[PDB]
């Protein structure tokens, strides 16, 4: 049936009883409950894979946080999410196996790296600048570069799941921000600009050029 595993993360976050578990944008599991470990600083979660897909987790499978917006209301529109990916050559992950909680998809080092050149480099910022999908974060701009000349490139680490949503008829559309609104105080994801990742048939490839979207 519904498989039930534990992550160590060294602190909760943003994460509760509730929160859900998502491989490539589809929910998969729930975070069931959590305590903390009288032996280290952090606290063990309880995460419940539902039986449909027990089979996505494996032995060699890593977590890490992932943030969400699904739409105070305004801080609330932002909230903690656990990614993780299935690795081919791996071991069907057992009953109550335990797992680390990587601080983000660059902490697990399981990303793909993407190649993009972009008309300009405002706005985007290395490692803050997220790559969304329908409202879930499944990738993050690693490095800008600002040629001279005016000839913008960079780098996007992405979920290892989301690479065969990369194709030639997908694009990559730069997004304005959700919220533009007086305060600062506010998650990037809602006051930066960010990525979304549109899917495309076609060849696979790793290299595409960004074009502003509605």
Same mark, same amino acid.
């Given at each position: 049936?519904?498989?039930?595993?534990?992550?160590?993360?060294?602190?909760?976050?943003?994460?509760?009883?509730?929160?859900?578990?998502?491989?490539?944008?589809?929910?998969?599991?729930?975070?069931?409950?959590?305590?903390?470990?009288?032996?280290?600083?952090?606290?063990?979660?309880?995460?419940?894979?539902?039986?449909?897909?027990?089979?996505?987790?494996?032995?060699?499978?890593?977590?890490?946080?992932?943030?969400?917006?699904?739409?105070?209301?305004?801080?609330?529109?932002?909230?903690?999410?656990?990614?993780?990916?299935?690795?081919?050559?791996?071991?069907?992950?057992?009953?109550?196996?335990?797992?680390?909680?990587?601080?983000?998809?660059?902490?697990?080092?399981? #990303?793909?790296?993407? &190649? =993009?050149? /972009?008309?300009? *480099?405002?706005?985007? @910022?290395?490692?803050? +600048?997220?790559?969304?999908?329908?409202?879930?974060?499944? #990738?993050?701009?690693? &490095? =800008?570069? /600002?040629?001279? *000349?005016?000839?913008? @490139?960079?780098?996007? +680490?992405?979920?290892?799941?989301?690479?065969?949503?990369?194709?030639?008829?997908?694009?990559?559309? /730069?997004?304005?921000?959700?919220?533009?609104?007086?305060?600062?105080?506010?998650?990037?994801?809602?006051?930066?600009?960010?990525?979304?990742?549109?899917?495309?048939?076609?060849?696979?490839?790793?290299?595409?050029?960004?074009?502003?979207?509605?």
């Amino acid at each position: 049936g519904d498989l039930m595993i534990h992550l160590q993360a060294p602190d909760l976050g943003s994460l509760n009883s509730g929160s859900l578990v998502y491989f490539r944008k589809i929910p998969v599991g729930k975070v069931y409950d959590y305590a903390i470990n009288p032996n280290k600083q952090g606290v063990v979660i309880d995460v419940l894979i539902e039986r449909r897909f027990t089979d996505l987790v494996k032995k060699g499978s890593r977590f890490w946080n992932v943030s969400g917006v699904d739409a105070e209301s305004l801080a609330a529109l932002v909230n903690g999410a656990i990614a993780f990916d299935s690795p081919e050559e791996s071991k069907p992950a057992e009953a109550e196996d335990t797992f680390g909680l990587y601080e983000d998809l660059a902490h697990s080092q399981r #990303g793909v790296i993407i &190649k =993009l050149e /972009l008309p300009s *480099g405002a706005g985007l @910022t290395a490692d803050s +600048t997220p790559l969304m999908y329908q409202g879930l974060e499944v #990738g993050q701009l690693t &490095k =800008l570069d /600002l040629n001279p *000349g005016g000839k913008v @490139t960079g780098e996007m +680490t992405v979920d290892p799941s989301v690479v065969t949503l990369l194709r030639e008829n997908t694009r990559i559309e /730069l997004r304005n921000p959700k919220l533009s609104l007086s305060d600062a105080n506010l998650s990037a994801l809602l006051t930066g600009k960010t990525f979304e990742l549109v899917p495309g048939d076609g060849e696979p490839r790793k290299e595409f050029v960004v074009v502003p979207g509605e």
